[PDB]
């Protein structure tokens, strides 16, 4: 409801994390903390630009990579959801935003 789960094939999760950092910076998204060894990072207020998005969105994301047997997975937790400074508790919206970041991660996964 507030967390997206990305399955990473070919054990690319070990190479994905640093690509996520690179892509985040490429999108001009500030990262507040990062940990290569623990493959975990936390972002600052991320503003998206959907075609039907008029209001300024803000809120943070926690991205943590976890091993899953012979494959990897990425946990993307939505830390905050504010539309024009208005907290939205709607789980559907939160899911949509949590997967909006996952989509950016999967873009870097395709590159890897």
Cα–Cα distance list, 75 to 8, 83, 102 (Å): 11, 23, 9
How crowded is the C-beta side of 49, counted as CA atoms within 13 Å?
3
Q: Which residues contact 12 (CB under 8 A, 6 or more apart)?
A: 72, 109, 112
Reduce the secondary structure of the chain to three states and give it as a string.
CCEEEEEEHHHCHHHHHHHHHHHHHHCCCCEEEEECCCCEEEECCCCCCCCCCCCCEECCEEEEEEEECCEEEEEEEECCCEECCCECCCHHHHHHHHHHHHHHHHHHHHHC
Domain definitions of the chain by residue range: 1-112
CATH code of domain 1-112: 3.30.530.50
Task: Tell me the sheet residues that pair with 57.
Answer: 83
Is residue 15 a contact partner of residue 108, using CB atoms and an 8 Å limit? no
Instruction: Return d(Cα 81, Cα 88) in angstroms, integer.
Output: 6
C-alpha to C-alpha distance for 58 and 84, rounded to whole angstroms: 8
């Amino acid at each position: 409801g507030d967390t997206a789960s990305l399955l990473v094939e070919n054990g690319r999760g070990n190479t994905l994390w640093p690509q996520v950092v690179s892509v985040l910076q490429a999108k001009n998204y500030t990262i507040t903390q990062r940990d290569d060894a623990g493959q975990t990072l936390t972002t600052d207020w991320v503003q998206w630009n959907r075609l039907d998005e008029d209001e300024q969105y803000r809120g943070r994301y926690q991205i943590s990579v976890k091993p899953q047997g012979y494959q990897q997975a990425v946990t993307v937790k939505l830390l905050n959801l504010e539309q024009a400074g208005k907290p939205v508790a709607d789980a559907a919206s939160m899911q949509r935003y949590s997967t909006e970041m996952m989509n950016v991660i999967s873009a870097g996964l395709d590159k890897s």
